[PDB]
Design a protein around this ligand. Structure first.
Ligand code: ERY
Lengths: 118, 7, 122, 114, 55, 209
RNA sequence: AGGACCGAACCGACUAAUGUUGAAAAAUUAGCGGAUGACUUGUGGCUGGGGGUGAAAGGCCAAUCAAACCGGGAGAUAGCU
RNA sequence: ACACAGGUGGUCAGGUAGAGAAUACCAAGGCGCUUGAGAGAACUCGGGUGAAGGAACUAGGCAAAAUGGUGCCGUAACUUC
RNA sequence: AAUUCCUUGUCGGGUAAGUUCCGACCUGCACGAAUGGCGUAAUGAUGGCCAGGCUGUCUCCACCCGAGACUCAGUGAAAU
RNA sequence: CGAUGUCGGCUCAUCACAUCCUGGGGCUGAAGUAGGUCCCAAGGGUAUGGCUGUUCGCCAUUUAAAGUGGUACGCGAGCUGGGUUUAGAACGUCGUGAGACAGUUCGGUCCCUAUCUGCCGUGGGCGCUGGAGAACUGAGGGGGGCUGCUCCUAGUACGAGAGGACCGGAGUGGACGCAUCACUGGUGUUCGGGUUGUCAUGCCAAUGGCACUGCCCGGUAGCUAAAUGCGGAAGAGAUAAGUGCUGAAAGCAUCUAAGCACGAAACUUGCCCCGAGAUGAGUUCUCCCUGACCCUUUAAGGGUCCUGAAGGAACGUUGAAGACGACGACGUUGAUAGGCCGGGUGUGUAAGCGCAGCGAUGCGUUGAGCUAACCGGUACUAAUGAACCGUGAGGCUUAACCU
């Protein structure tokens, strides 16, 4: 009955959820602003912010953990080279949600999730 | 099949 | 948590090697038996030279449980294997002389004091 | 919390020797039989430690005369008088329930020599 | 499963009394542009609270 | 005598030196200031009204702002009443701490229990689940039969069915007080009291003596 | 060698569950039986209604069988509703 | 009758592990099954785990759980040998 | 007894307890010798019974994972 | 008969009392213990198994007890389908036969998406006579009500002896219910680790995908029981059967006619929960509104401009609150959620580098690295200034008072 339980199921199983969050984290680090649905944007906050916190120290082990959680070497390159020195000052809150109407097809609540640089 | 039937 | 159809080992040397609970005595609709609890048993496997034979319906007292008894300290003592000491059907006194293995200090009371003054560990 | 942790740290015993599972540990516990109190040794293998502060416990498995006995001791209980580690074993799990499935030569474990 | 007799048009309208869609109370005005939008949403021209967010 | 309003702060255990461990619930009993006193001149029955805690000054409405600022007290969350059983007189603004529970021995704790949501008949009324096998068709945790036949022709009122479980007022009686802390304003009671951690409890001395 | 054995394709249909205004007017899922033979399958023929065919259940003969369907006697007849 | 979880004969048949056309993961190649978005109640379906007990369930161990491979050792009554 | 009414025949075995099962006895209401009698190794998705193992069948349910049910937008039936 | 689905089992019950237990009494061929029998009493309780399709019954073993009936022999739009009672096949028997058998045997499709009443929950509207926010009284309604055993009195009263109390007082259990996870556990497909097969990241090393979470080993928080606290009461009133006191009718006698007292788990309270839609709509406290005009059917009238107050709703962040509504916290004059930091917990000594080894691997760095839902903090991110609804002192009559 869900009393103090985090995480959204998002009408997927565990493997689909984890693969979908890995794809969305790749797209967000790549494009720096992506449009998505609202609860997927909140869960994507909880997924993509530890990767940026992992980029704050640049070593072989941390880059291997980032590769284990993104599986794209261009993503871990952009993380440890750009998002590391850029986000070095602020402590948490590397991302920003903005609601943008509703989807035309399924009336889904939309959102833009972006990084706090732009 | 004589189960519901009053037989 | 000895209920009926539970197969217990025998702690003393009355002759049985394996008994089965057929009734947990004391109280209507009682489900389980802890250490302090008399059970009615039948004897399923006996030694050929023993004091009791197979098919005897008599009483016993549980001395070891795999569920384990809880101390008032917050502790719990869980043995391995369930065991009982066989008693006289009416006299409530044990049948065999020596008692094998440990028992609990929860058992300390008159008839089971006669039991507990025979065991190696408590 | 701030109040619960405070009450429990004023409840907690100051000196308890830190051990790991696999360590052959002999616990001396208080035993009451009416007027007179006694101390009683329980020596066996630490198979499980549950660190929770005041609510810590540890399970010790000892083979008595034909039987296997497991005793869960609350660490900061007053009835535990002394904990002494007699042999230090070198398992690599934190829990050792396969010692419940084992017997004899299979239930022996290697010494640490850290 | 089935009805014993059909309901009236009166009992149909009483049932549909609770189906009225609520209107938005009022749209809020942006500070710079002046375009109406929902609260806590960006405008159609990508302004939120006086800041151009999307291109 | 009257009860005091506190907050459920977790559960722990204390070790008596005899060896026995007892589970206590810790109840933070803050200073309860009396806001309004009812008497049988105006009201027909005599009572006191207390508040405790604190609230934001911007989260207080002018009705309750004026009601607190009428007689000597400051803003706490909630207002409660106590029925003054024959021989207590309290001035408004009187701070009432936990010494009356330092004297007493048994206690009644009243709280709103944890809301288990829409529960079925098995969870709510301890119904017996039917057969899991041996032929059963879509009827494992269903409530069974709910009535007889043509002769009543209707379900009876108070028939135990599924519905809202939890989230209701529950009183637990005859809980022993094990320790009273006055410098921490704490109350250790033995056992378990209704509610989640942080929920507001009402603590009265025991009536079933 | 074998109407041998275990076991896929292939053929079947023993149990359970689901479906029962179905996804399906006979299925699905998970187990199940035979699987070199008295096997299975394609293509083409032949047997026809008191007739066929049947390792036989009154089974099958175009979702129809103690006498198929179509059309005609025919608006059979109905002390019955 | 449907853009219907059914049915429908032949040909080709790669890699690793495997006895294998089983099975697991892949290649060439082809698809994500023409409503989605949330939430994470009862109940239903399909599964996973379970203290102590172990058929006490029930018409009935139904359904599950268990067992499972290769090589060697050993193997009873009875027998149509 | 796939046959037996009376009937749960009576005795024995198996069970703490056995209208079923197994062995007997014959009182065969109403077996019986190719509409075959009595055996019988092997076989059986065959009927009954007992045992070991195994387990959520059960004591007595608990939690978790997914698909519906619930809410939102689109389309939109049926029995009666 | 243009259909009212059977026996048994399961699940859930509900009532009667012709009471099985518990409770109260009378008589006894009632010493005690234990009974028998009758009267009062329906608050609560009232087995598990073997056999059988069975209800029943027999049997084994308990219990304080193992009530008896009604409710379509309660209950299939709740489940089952063993039995009887479809189509197959056989036995005995009957029949020349087709076939038949309250005779047996083996096998045999149990549909329904709930409109209305009902019931369990949970909301919207309007009312309650100015509006609002709270806290309550409580009419009334519901839940609950079981009981064993041990010890003391006391081995006393009683009895030859064997035996052995009433009354009263504690303790400790069983079943049942409510609550909550501190403990002990379960779960923990969101945490850590091992490992098999294969594919990929160029390769090594390291990881990832898939194979039921691939198979497993532990396990945080939540939820939860088998875990652990609590409950059933005492008391009060009025009584039933019963026992009385005084007392005539009826010089006596008499519990009764006048009058008075006792007397049960039943009744009313006491305990707990809901509850002013209790339209008979209650009480208490606090807060908010103090402007002008015209018209007409000068009415508890309509309209226009100016003001929108307390508060509410909407929106957003959300919650040990929740199907949705609702409920609760917060909205920068800010710890509501995420992140971050520190800790805790869990798992078990990461990777890389170096050494020993031919190697698998071991050792050092190192109780390392990683850590979900937890804890204490921190405005880093998101909770926007507003707009919207709600008004502008609130009728008549009578009484009592105040200027
Ligand atoms: C798939 C769904 C099918 O229904 C079933 O399978 C159920 C399970 C049958 O029970 C089956 C199975 C069974 C055992 O009954 C459960 C059997 O007794 C009956 C004869 O057939 C039903 C209900 C029968 O009714 C019963 O008929 C009895 C003569 C009288 C009884 N009444 C007194 C109450 C009545 O409800 C009957 C005749 O088939 C109903 C007619 C209308 C139909 O033929 C319809 C088209 C059905 O086939 C069906 C809806 O498609």
């Amino acid at each position: 009955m869900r009393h103090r339980k985090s995480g959204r199921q998002l009408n997927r199983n565990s493997s689909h959820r984890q693969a979908m969050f890995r794809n969305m984290a790749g797209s967000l680090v790549r494009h720096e602003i992506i449009k998505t649905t609202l609860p997927k944007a909140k869960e994507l906050r909880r997924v993509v912010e530890p990767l940026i916190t992992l980029a704050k120290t640049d070593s072989v082990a941390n880059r291997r953990l980032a590769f284990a959680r993104t599986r794209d070497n261009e993503i871990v390159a952009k993380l440890f080279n750009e998002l590391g020195p850029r986000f070095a000052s602020r402590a948490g809150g590397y991302t920003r949600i903005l609601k943008c109407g509703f989807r035309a097809g399924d009336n889904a609540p939309m959102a833009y999730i972006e990084l706090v640089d732009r | 099949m004589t189960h519901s039937m009053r037989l | 948590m000895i209920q009926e159809q539970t197969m217990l080992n025998v702690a003393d040397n009355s002759g049985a090697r394996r008994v089965m609970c057929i009734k947990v005595l004391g109280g209507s609709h009682r489900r389980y038996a802890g250490v302090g609890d008399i059970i009615k048993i039948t004897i399923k496997e006996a030694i050929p030279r023993g004091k009791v034979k197979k098919g005897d319906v008599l009483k016993a007292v549980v001395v070891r449980t795999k569920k384990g008894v809880r101390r008032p300290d917050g502790s719990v003592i869980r043995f391995d294997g369930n065991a009982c000491v066989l008693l006289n059907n009416n006299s409530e006194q044990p049948i065999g002389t020596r008692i094998f293995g440990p028992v609990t200090r929860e058992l300390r009371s008159e008839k089971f004091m006669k039991i507990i003054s025979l065991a190696p560990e408590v | 919390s701030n109040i619960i942790k405070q009450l429990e740290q004023e409840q907690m015993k100051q000196d308890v020797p830190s051990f790991r599972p696999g360590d052959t540990v002999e616990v001396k516990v208080w035993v009451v039989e009416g007027s007179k109190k006694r101390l009683q040794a329980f020596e066996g293998v630490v198979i499980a430690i549950r660190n929770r502060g005041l609510h810590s416990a540890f399970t010790v498995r000892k083979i008595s005369n034909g039987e296997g006995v497991e005793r869960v001791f609350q660490t900061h209980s007053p009835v535990v008088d002394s904990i002494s580690v007699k042999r230090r074993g070198a398992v690599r799990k934190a829990k050792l329930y396969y010692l419940r499935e084992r017997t004899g030569k299979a239930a022996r474990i290697k010494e640490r020599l850290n | 499963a089935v009805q014993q007799n059909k309901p009236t048009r009166s009992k149909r309208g009483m049932r549909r009394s609770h189906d009225a869609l609520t209107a938005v109370t009022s749209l809020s005005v942006d500070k710079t542009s002046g375009e109406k939008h929902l609260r806590h949403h960006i405008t159609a021209d990508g302004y939120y609270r006086g800041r151009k967010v999307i291109a | 005598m009257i009860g005091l309003v506190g907050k459920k702060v977790g559960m722990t255990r204390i070790f008596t030196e005899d060896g026995v461990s007892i589970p206590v619930t810790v109840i933070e009993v803050e200073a309860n200031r009396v806001t309004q006193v009812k008497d049988l001149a105006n009201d027909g029955y005599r009572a006191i009204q207390v508040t405790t805690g604190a609230k934001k000054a911007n989260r207080v409405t002018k009705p309750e702002a004026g009601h607190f600022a009428k007689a000597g007290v400051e803003a706490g969350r909630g207002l409660w009443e106590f029925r003054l059983a024959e021989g207590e007189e309290f001035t408004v603004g009187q701070s009432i701490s936990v010494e009356l529970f330092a004297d007493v021995k048994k206690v009644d704790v009243t709280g709103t229990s944890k809301g288990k949501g829409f529960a079925g008949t098995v969870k709510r009324w301890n119904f017996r689940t039917q057969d899991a096998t041996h032929g059963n068709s879509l009827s494992h945790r269903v409530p069974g039969s709910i009535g007889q036949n043509q002769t009543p022709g209707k379900v009876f009122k108070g028939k135990k069915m599924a519905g809202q479980m939890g989230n209701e007022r529950v009183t637990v009686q005859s809980l022993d007080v094990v320790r009273v802390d006055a410098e921490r304003n704490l109350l250790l009671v033995k056992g378990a009291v209704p509610g989640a951690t942080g929920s507001d409890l009402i603590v009265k001395p025991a009536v079933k003596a």
